[PDB]
């Protein structure tokens, strides 16, 4: 009863089209973020998903009241009837303000005109990536929000408390498959748009990729294919179709693994770290078949040694060399590879 | 202080018909535009389109909004753009666009004491391309964005790129993963229809494709598989299973590469350049098995009625023919 005429008295002399203190001073908006669940980081789109309860607060002198209550916890219809800063995420792609079952917005008015206006957002944000250490890389995924129409002279953003404690990531909402979340970095910036200067808040979420999926699906297949293509030496030199079928099939296996591992990725112009590994392993399996061609150039007979003993063939010299040469070079390459890239 | 501003705004818009072009019987309005491109997200050959995010901005001088006394520029809430005139500009290349919604509908109204109004939109559109992929993946793709007034003809509305060549900004900040923008042009022209002549603008890029991704994925394993087709020349004619297995396995590997590239790529009627190259490599691979059939027939069939001379000749012929083919190929397209 009383609160009806209180709210009517508030909306009597009110305009929701112009900033509080339009010709007097800046409007200090005190922003705040509660990250409930940091959603899955789509590499192919170079994006990620985040769901946040987006807090804002400012002071409007026109919304002072006196009554039985201190704070008016209200319906979001009145939040649509009142000025609200046009905060937009600078790197959102297709972001959704949830309205099931009602628009998830709370407006709270304390009696001295200090508004609280929190939304519940899902921001499909744009994280530019440097995948040159794929998959053993790590990079900062930013989240940057400013006003759209109000300059530095009109609306200035802050954080409610100290910046690194303001943005809170909740614990139950991991929602990450590959990446790990090592922490955020809360800051503040200024842009220089054609229209004018603006205040830009910034959080940089830091993500290091777990390489367990990529080891299992790409590295151990390539490693065991190379182990196979080096097992071919311990056959004899006379089993020409055995070593022939052996070498060209492991080549086919490496070609299959090549295309089916590069598929899990965007189409960048350089070569990633997994590309270096796949190319070197494919060079080993290529060199195994060139080695057998070099063996078969010097065969000089047609049969092999019978168990009961004409001449025979000896075990060839490049066979005895390559049995020790190629697994040693593969072990050296593994040492150099997994000491180089697990440094960064 | 502030009630004067509210009074000024309320006396601007009382008696303001928003269904009327400014100077409704007189000269056309000179609507000037401005594009600040945020990103280009995907450039899809499958759907022949690309997603473009931009800060699309428009100036025009609406003479019925010319206030007085207030020394500043009236930056208002976005919902007062419902109570103004705005131009009906659309995009012909557009498939599915949206003004962003979080946290509000991203509009701006910035009034000026001469009556100039700015209307800014963060638009993420999806513009179409007639991609000519005959030189794929060694092509320069041209893609446009055709801005045009819908209802008002050239007698009612005029479009100029405000700033000349520096209207569209943010082009140099775009780092597409597999393209490289060479040029963007800014074309202003009138377009006739059955209903009249309308002003069209044209932001229009040129996307040149980075070429290293396909060398890694397709070209280099094609070269090395075609090379490993030639191990049969260093194997005896007696070893039948050896030469037949490598020749059969290399036509299988070329089959797998081509099936992967036909799964990636759209349904185009001609033969692309990467398909010309795989057809050429498959010709070498197929002839590397026809050679063994030829050798087997000459020895075992025309025997009682040279053999090693075929291998000695072909070891010189096939690397020379393959290098000659790559010479003609990579000097035709590159």
């Amino acid at each position, epitope marked *: 009863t009383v609160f009806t005429r209180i709210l009517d008295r508030l909306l009597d002399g009110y305009d929701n089209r112009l900033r509080p203190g339009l010709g007097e001073r800046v409007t200090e908006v005190k922003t705040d973020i509660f990250v409930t669940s940091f959603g899955p980081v789509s590499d192919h789109d170079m994006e990620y998903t985040i769901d946040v309860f987006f807090r804002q607060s400012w002071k409007d002198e026109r919304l002072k009241f006196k009554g039985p209550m201190t704070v008016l916890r209200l319906n979001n219809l009145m939040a649509s009837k009142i000025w609200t800063p046009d905060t937009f995420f600078h790197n959102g792609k297709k972001s959704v303000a949830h309205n099931m079952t009602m628009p998830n917005k709370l407006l709270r008015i304390t009696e001295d005109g200090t508004l609280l206006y929190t939304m519940r957002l899902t921001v499909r944000a744009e994280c530019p990536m440097h995948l040159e250490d794929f998959p053993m890389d790590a*990079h*900062a995924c930013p989240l940057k929000f400013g006003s759209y129409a109000y300059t530095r002279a009109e609306v200035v953003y802050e954080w409610t408390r100290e910046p690194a404690r303001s943005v809170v990531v909740a614990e139950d909402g991991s929602r990450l498959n590959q990446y790990d979340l090592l922490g955020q*970095t809360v800051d503040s*910036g*200024i*842009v*220089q748009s054609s229209t004018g200067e603006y205040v830009v808040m910034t959080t*940089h979420f830091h993500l290091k990729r777990k390489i367990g999926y990529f080891v299992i699906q790409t590295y151990l297949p390539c490693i065991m294919t190379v182990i196979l293509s080096q097992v071919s030496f311990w056959l004899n030199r006379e089993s020409v179709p055995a070593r022939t079928v052996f070498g060209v099939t492991t080549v086919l296996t490496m070609t299959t693994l090549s295309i089916s591992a590069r598929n899990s990725l965007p189409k960048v112009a350089y070569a990633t770290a997994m590309d270096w590994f796949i190319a070197v392993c494919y060079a080993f399996v290529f060199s195994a078949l060139i080695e057998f061609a070099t063996v078969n150039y010097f065969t000089k007979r047609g049969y092999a040694w019978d168990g009961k003993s004409k001449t025979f063939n000896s075990v060839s010299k490049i066979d005895r060399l390559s049995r020790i040469a190629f697994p040693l070079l593969f072990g050296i390459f593994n040492l150099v590879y997994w000491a180089t890239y697990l440094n960064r | 202080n502030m009630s004067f501003v509210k009074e000024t705004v309320d006396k601007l818009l009382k008696g303001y018909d928003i269904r009327l072009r400014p100077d409704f019987g007189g000269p056309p309005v000179c609507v000037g535009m401005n594009i600040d491109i945020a990103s280009i997200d995907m450039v899809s050959e499958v759907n022949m389109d690309y997603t473009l995010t931009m800060y699309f901005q428009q100036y025009w001088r609406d003479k019925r909004l010319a206030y007085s006394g207030i020394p500043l520029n009236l930056t208002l809430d976005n919902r007062v753009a419902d109570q103004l005139w705005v131009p009906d500009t659309y995009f012909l290349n557009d498939k599915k666009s949206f003004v962003h919604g979080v946290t509000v509908k991203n509009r701006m109204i910035r009034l000026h004491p001469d009556g100039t109004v700015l209307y800014g939109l963060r638009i993420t559109t999806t513009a179409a391309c007639m991609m000519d992929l005959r030189r794929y993946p060694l092509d320069e793709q041209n893609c446009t964005l055709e801005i045009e007034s819908y209802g008002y003809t050239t007698d009612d509305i005029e479009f100029y790129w405000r700033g000349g060549d520096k209207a569209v900004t943010g082009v140099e*900040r775009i780092e597409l993963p597999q393209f490289s923008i060479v040029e963007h042009r800014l074309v202003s022209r009138n377009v006739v229809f059955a209903t009249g002549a309308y002003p069209r603008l044209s932001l229009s890029f040129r996307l040149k494709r980075n070429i290293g991704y396909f060398i890694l994925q397709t070209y280099m394993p094609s070269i090395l598989i075609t090379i490993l087709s030639w191990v049969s020349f260093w194997i005896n004619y007696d070893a039948s299973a050896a030469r037949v297995a490598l020749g059969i396995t290399t036509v299988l590997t070329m089959t797998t590469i081509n099936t992967h590239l036909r799964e990636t790529l759209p349904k185009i009627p001609y033969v692309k350049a990467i398909d010309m190259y795989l057809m050429g490599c498959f010709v070498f691979v197929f002839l590397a098995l026809l050679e063994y059939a030829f050798v087997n027939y000459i020895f075992f069939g025309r025997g009682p009625q040279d053999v090693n001379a075929i291998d000695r000749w072909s070891r010189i012929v096939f690397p020379f023919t393959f290098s000659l083919f790559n010479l003609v190929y990579w000097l035709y397209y590159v």
Partner: nanobody, 108 residues
Framework: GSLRVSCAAS????????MAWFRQAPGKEREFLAA???????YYGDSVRGRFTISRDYAKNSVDLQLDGLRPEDTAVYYC?????????????????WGQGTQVTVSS
């Protein structure tokens, strides 16, 4: 006085990268002056907030720290930096590419 300290890169386009300027006073103290993101966002240090202006040219791959209001305490070495800011923009270890440095000396 005023000064325009530039940094013209080559070998890699750093448009994606956050090109920044560092000040090193004598005392082994790399200090973060200014850095600009790919999306035209200027980040300023606390001691220099409102004095220096940073501006990149993404065509020419440069960063241009404009100097103004030069106190005698700005006598130090000015490094051009570049990186991807993992645990970045406030730390010197986040940058994996560096300039040589330049002593800028103020005489009062």
């Amino acid at each position: 006085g005023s000064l325009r300290v530039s940094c013209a890169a080559s070998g890699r386009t750093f448009t994606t990268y956050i090109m920044a300027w560092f000040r090193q006073a004598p005392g082994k103290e790399r200090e973060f002056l200014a850095a600009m993101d790919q999306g035209r966002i200027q980040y300023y240090g606390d001691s220099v907030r409102g004095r220096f202006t940073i501006s990149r040219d993404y065509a020419k791959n440069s960063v241009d720290l404009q100097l103004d209001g030069l106190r005698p305490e700005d006598t130090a070495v000015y490094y051009c930096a570049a990186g991807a800011g993992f645990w970045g923009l406030r730390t010197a270890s986040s940058y994996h590419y560096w300039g040589q440095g330049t002593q800028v000396t103020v005489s009062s």
